[PDB]
Design a binder for this molecule. Structure first.
Ligand SMILES: NC(=O)c1ccc[n+]([C@@H]2O[C@H](COP(=O)([O-])OP(=O)(O)OC[C@H]3O[C@@H](n4cnc5c(N)ncnc54)[C@H](OP(=O)(O)O)[C@@H]3O)[C@@H](O)[C@H]2O)c1
Ligand SMILES: O=C(O)COc1cc(Cl)ccc1C(=O)NCc1cccc([N+](=O)[O-])c1
Length: 316
């Protein structure tokens, strides 16, 4: 299948990208260099991941080496929750641009719909462990994102972890100038997201699937927790196709017209994860994988459950 999807800003986005959350700063430069050498042209980044400088070293070296042209890369980053205020958005973007060694981003996302009190801490808490909110709403934050397009800092803007009512809130924003191009959400066979994906696709918003392997390195993993990579049912589909379980989990979202961003710092896995354009899952395989949905979420924080804009109280 085609390697890129057309966005509603007229630009093409590679459907496979490299994730970078948890990639250690002393490993991620090599990881990104390896990824570009073996064909990745999309890197998913964020200021909160604390490794954009090191990601940037890799990107710059491959540009300098003329392995790739800047126009051929699709670099994504995200506005952290403590920068939702109007007056902080441009500087947050510029800090990311500086760390990544870029003069524009292809896509910049509102990372989470929830805004937090600005300051040095990424998760400001009160004395009982609740996050301290920002009174800035998603529509004013969106207007600030729109300004970044008009200043040439970003080619496209989008959202991440927005539920359908929140997406609808931006789509219905008075004076909306740019529609979100992308909603990046968690999506895998245990959280299949049929309702939110159809909503977004029906609006011409491209959906990016994060944690496609179930984030086995997430820091809050429990023993109890389901494991996609070890699910014998998925292992059997992989065996049938002479592919790895990871490769099935990556191809699955691709065939739903999603973008997918598996993370690895292991060079052999980075290469393996890209070798997903030479096989097809059957319609039966797809429906079978969809059937494993358990509404199981890697990413959701108890500290944020009372924030006005917490996204996961809603069904979708
Ligand atoms: N927008 C958001 O709020 C949000 C939230 C979560 C994630 N994301 C983005 O989505 C990315 C992907 O999600 P994720 O990092 O949570 O988890 P993931 O991609 O589902 O899983 C990454 C884990 O899988 C292992 N792995 C990778 N390829 C493998 C393979 N072929 N075989 C066996 N194990 C393999 C990795 O190990 P090694 O690295 O040790 O190889 C790592 O432990 C993130 O890195 C981030 O860029 C965005
Ligand atoms: O968010 C990501 O991309 C991945 O997860 C990260 C990454 C880092 Cl570096 C730090 C913390 C997290 C995390 O707890 N994310 C979950 C989260 C955050 C904010 C709000 C919520 N929420 O539920 O409103 C949830």
């Amino acid at each position: 299948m085609a390697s890129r999807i057309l966005l509603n800003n007229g630009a093409k986005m590679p459907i496979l990208g490299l994730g970078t959350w948890k990639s250690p700063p002393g490993q991620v430069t090599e990881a990104v260099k390896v990824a570009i050498d073996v064909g990745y042209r999309h890197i998913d980044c964020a200021h909160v991941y604390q490794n954009e400088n090191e990601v940037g070293v890799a990107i710059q070296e491959k540009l300098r080496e003329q392995v790739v042209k800047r126009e051929e890369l699709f670099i994504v980053s995200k506005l952290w929750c403590t920068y939702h205020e109007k007056g902080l958005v441009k500087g947050a973007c510029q800090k990311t641009l500086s760390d990544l060694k870029l003069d524009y981003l292809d896509l910049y996302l509102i990372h989470w719909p929830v805004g937090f009190k600005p300051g040095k801490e990424f998760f400001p808490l009160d004395e009982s462990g609740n996050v301290v909110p920002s009174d800035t709403n998603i529509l004013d934050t969106w207007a600030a994102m729109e300004e970044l397009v008009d200043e040439g800092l970003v080619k496209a803007i989008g959202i991440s972890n927005f539920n359908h009512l929140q997406v609808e809130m931006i789509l219905n924003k008075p004076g909306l100038k740019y529609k979100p191009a992308v909603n990046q959400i968690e999506c895998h066979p245990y959280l299949t997201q049929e309702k939110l994906i159809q909503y977004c696709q029906s609006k011409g918003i491209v959906v990016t699937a994060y944690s496609p392997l179930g984030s086995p390195d997430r820091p809050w993993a429990k023993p109890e927790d389901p494991s996609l990579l070890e699910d014998p049912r998925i292992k059997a589909i992989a065996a049938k196709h002479n592919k790895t379980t990871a490769q099935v989990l990556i191809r699955f979202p691709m065939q739903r017209n999603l973008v997918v961003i598996p993370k690895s710092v292991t060079p052999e896995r980075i290469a393996e994860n890209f070798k997903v354009f030479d096989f097809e899952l059957s319609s039966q395989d797809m429906t079978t994988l969809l059937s494993y949905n358990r509404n199981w979420r890697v990413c959701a924080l108890l500290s944020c459950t009372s924030h006005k804009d917490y996204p996961f109280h809603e069904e979708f």
